[PDB]
Design a protein around this ligand. Structure first.
Ligand SMILES: [Mg+2]
Length: 66
């Protein structure tokens, strides 16, 4: 699992990007977020994730804060 910070995340629309130094920013959709409760992220929040890539291009998967 990679380590990133949430660059930004629009909490009402449910998407944003994850920073990871030395690499491109990674799109994160609300559906990638793990855990219980309301699926969202805040700015500057550290995360653990995977980059999955099919024919649509790379995005985040298995995003956990803690
Ligand atoms: Mg990948």
């Amino acid at each position: 699992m990679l380590e990133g910070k949430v660059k930004w995340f629009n909490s009402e629309k449910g998407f944003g990007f994850i920073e990871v130094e030395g690499q491109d920013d990674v799109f994160v959709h609300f559906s990638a977020i793990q855990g219980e409760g309301f699926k969202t992220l805040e700015e500057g929040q550290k995360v653990r994730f995977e980059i999955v890539e099919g024919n649509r291009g790379p995005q985040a998967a298995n995003v956990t804060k803690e």
